[PDB]
Each structure stands twice: as C-alpha cells, then as structure tokens.
Amino acid sequence: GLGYGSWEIDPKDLTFLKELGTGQFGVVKYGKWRGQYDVAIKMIKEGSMSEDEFIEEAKVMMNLSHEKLVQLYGVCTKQRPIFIITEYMANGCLLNYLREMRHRFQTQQLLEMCKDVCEAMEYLESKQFLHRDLAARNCLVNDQGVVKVSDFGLSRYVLDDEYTSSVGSKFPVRWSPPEVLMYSKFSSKSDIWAFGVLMWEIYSLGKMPYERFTNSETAEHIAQGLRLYRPHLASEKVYTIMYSCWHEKADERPTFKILLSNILDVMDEES
Ligand SMILES: CN(C)C[C@H](O)COc1ccc(Nc2ncc3[nH]c(=O)c(=O)n(-c4ccc5c(c4)CCC5)c3n2)cc1
C-alpha cells in the first residue's frame, strides 16, 4: 500500500509467534504475514549493519528466486531496529541438524543435501552473485528436510570488524582458499572452495573443519598445500568431488555447473 515500495513490508502485517534465537545481527523470530504466511523476522541490532547499503542490495536479492535459496520477502526500514523478512525454515540451521545423531542419516540423504546447496550455488553463479560466506551455519532446513542456502552476500554489510577481515577474530578462515587468506582475493572460486568445506561438514555430521587446529594453524596448513581429509561417510567418489574444490590454483577448481554434474553422477552410481 501507500508508503511501501516493492521491497518494503509493513511491520503492522506481522504477527510474532516464537523466538528462534539470536544471530550476529540480533534476535530472529518466527511469525505470520497477513495472518496466513509463515515468515522469519531478523531484527537488526542498531550499529550492526550497513543499513542503507543493505537496503539497496535487498532490491537485487529479492529477484534471486530459486527453490534452494531462502527467499528474501522484504524489509521493514521505517524505524529501528529494521527487520529483514525471509522464508521460514522449520528445521533450523543445517549445522545443528547434522549434529543431531538421532537422524541416523543414510549417505544418500547427505549427498542430497550437497545437491540442494550445489543447485542454489549454480543459480547464484549463473547470476554472477557471490555468496561470500558459504558454510553449513548459513544453510537452513525446511519441514521436508530440503536444505537451502541463506544470507547470500550479507557479510558485505557487517560492521563488526572481527568478522570482515583476516585481521579480525571471527573471519571464516576454515572456509577460505589460500588466495583469500594471503591476498583477500574473493571470486567464484572462493565460493567453490567453501562449498568443498561444506560438503566436508555434511559428510562429517557437522564437525568443525580442522577441529584440532586454531585458525592461525589452519591458515599455515592450507598455505603448505595440505588439506582436510576424507570423512568416514564419504565414498571415494564423494571425496574426489570435495577435494576438487581445493586445488591450490583457483582456475583449476570446477564451476558449480561441473560440481552439480559430478554430484548427479554419483547419485546415479550410488543409488
Ligand atoms: C529447538 N532447538 C533445538 C533449535 C533452536 O530453537 C533453533 O531453532 C531454529 C532456528 C532457525 C529456524 N528457522 C529459520 N528460518 C528462516 C531464517 N531466516 C533468517 O534470516 C535467519 O536468520 N534465520 C536464523 C538462522 C540461524 C539462527 C536463527 C535464525 C536463530 C539462531 C540461529 C532463520 N531461521 C528454525 C528453528
């Protein structure tokens, strides 16, 4: 209605039902939009986000529509804290889901999770849109057990310097290729590297990558040309796929289209 652009949701249309938890921008709630539609509501803590830049980017993000991407529905930006309204994913973050041993996952279920994420990433790659912080903690799981990629590009708007540089103390060192750690060279191939690490997280049922090392030690390890090794649940063919994401030379790493093809081939050979 009047006073709201196509990217803008009227907060008066929201019914708040449950608190999901706190993320790095603050509290996230579950609710309904116009009494019927499930939504998640990020409530953005004052001083945590580059809000004007995010709002301009939200316009681009809302047009990134793919079944395996958590949809941005709109933003509430007339008052602080601002809200980001997203698709609701009932089974929570992927990292926590993997760590719940009750699920007793078959490897075919783990490969399907990888395929979900790979499809999202092939879509973003086709739109020349980098995720910039791909990891299991940034994927969500719906009530059907479908995995979707969330928070694509959002690291660009984080004002906490601990997150936004290697000199910072919350930077995703363990998901980063050597050229990011050495030179801050972000590209499609840094997303590819991260996706390999995410496959490793899935097949390890949510272990921390390089779990016995510090971030500094991890940086040195990968700079010496050394890598993660094979999760017990990963077949030889699955391991080859994740390992292909870690070529020292970025231009030798596959595309998301190639990875998707490889993952489908393994699904065919292993089901
Ligand atoms: C019961 N117990 C064991 C699980 C906890 O109760 C956590 O349950 C949860 C968490 C998230 C969801 N679903 C959802 N759906 C769309 C989201 N969109 C966002 O932008 C967004 O930022 N989060 C989110 C992402 C990560 C985290 C939170 C929110 C809260 C802390 C971690 C979204 N979480 C469901 C259930």
Tell which phi-psi region holds residue 19, choosing left (phi > 0), alpha (psi between -120 and 50) or beta.
beta
- Pair 135, 198: CB distance under 8 Å: yes
The CA distances from residue 247 to 103, 180, 203, in Å, are: 33, 13, 20
Same fold: 1-88 with 89-271: no
- Pair 86, 62: CB distance under 8 Å: no
Q: Is 32 exposed, middle or buried (0-12, 13-18, 19+ CB in 10 A)?
A: middle
Rounded CA-CA distance 184/173 in Å is 11
The CA 20 to ligand 1 mean position distance, Å, reads 5
Other beta carbons within 10 angstroms of residue 132's beta carbon come to 18
What is the H or E stretch that residue 206 is in? none
- Pull the structure tokens for residue 184: 């801050």
Q: What CATH code would you report for 89-271?
A: 1.10.510.10
- Site to probe by mutation for ligand 1, drawn from 20, 83, 150 as the one with most ligand atoms within 8 Å of Cβ, is 20
Task: Please enumerate in sequence order all residues whose Cβ is within 8 A of that of 150, keeping only pairs 6 or more positions apart, or say none.
Answer: 69, 70, 86, 89, 138, 139, 140
Other beta carbons within 10 angstroms of residue 134's beta carbon come to 27
Q: Does 26 appear as a known binding residue?
A: yes
Strand order in the sheet with 83-86: 14-23, 26-33, 37-43, 83-86, 72-76
Nearest Cα neighbor of 92 from 144, 142, 24 is 142
- Pull the structure tokens for residue 34: 């116009």
The CA distances from residue 242 to 11, 48, 78, 194, 198, in Å, are: 42, 34, 44, 10, 9
- Pair 139, 147: CB distance under 8 Å: yes
Task: Name which residue sits closest to atom 26 of ligand 1, judged by CA.
Answer: 93
The CA 128 to ligand 1 mean position distance, Å, reads 27
Rounded CA-CA distance 263/248 in Å is 22
- Say which CATH topology domain 1-88 has: Phosphorylase Kinase; domain 1 (3.30.200)
- Method of elucidation: X-ray
Residues with CB under 6 A from ligand 1: 20-23, 28, 40, 42, 70, 86, 88-90, 92-93, 140, 150
3-state secondary structure of 161: coil
Task: Name which residue sits closest to atom 5 of ligand 1, judged by CA.
Answer: 20
What is the DSSP-derived secondary structure letter of residue 69?
Answer: B
Nearest Cα neighbor of 107 from 230, 235, 257 is 235
Burial profile 203-242: b = 16 or more Cβ within 10 angstroms, e = fewer = bbbbeebbeebebeebbeebeeeebbebbeebbeebbebb
Declared resolution, Å: 1.4
- Pull the structure tokens for residue 61: 């993000």
- Pair 158, 24: CB distance under 8 Å: yes
Rounded CA-CA distance 117/186 in Å is 19
Looking at the annotation, which residues are catalytic? 133
Index of the ligand 1 atom closest to the CA of residue 87: 16
Other beta carbons within 10 angstroms of residue 109's beta carbon come to 12
Q: What is the CA radius of gyration of the chain?
A: 19
Nearest Cα neighbor of 88 from 131, 23, 140 is 140
3-state secondary structure of 78: coil
Residue in the structure block whose two tokens are 């580059």: 50
Extents of the domains making up the chain: 1-88, 89-271
- Pull the structure tokens for residue 149: 């990629």
- Pull the structure tokens for residue 233: 């649940």
**Does the N-terminal peptide bond of residue 81 adopt cis geometry, omega within 30 degrees of 0?**
yes
3-state secondary structure of 42: strand
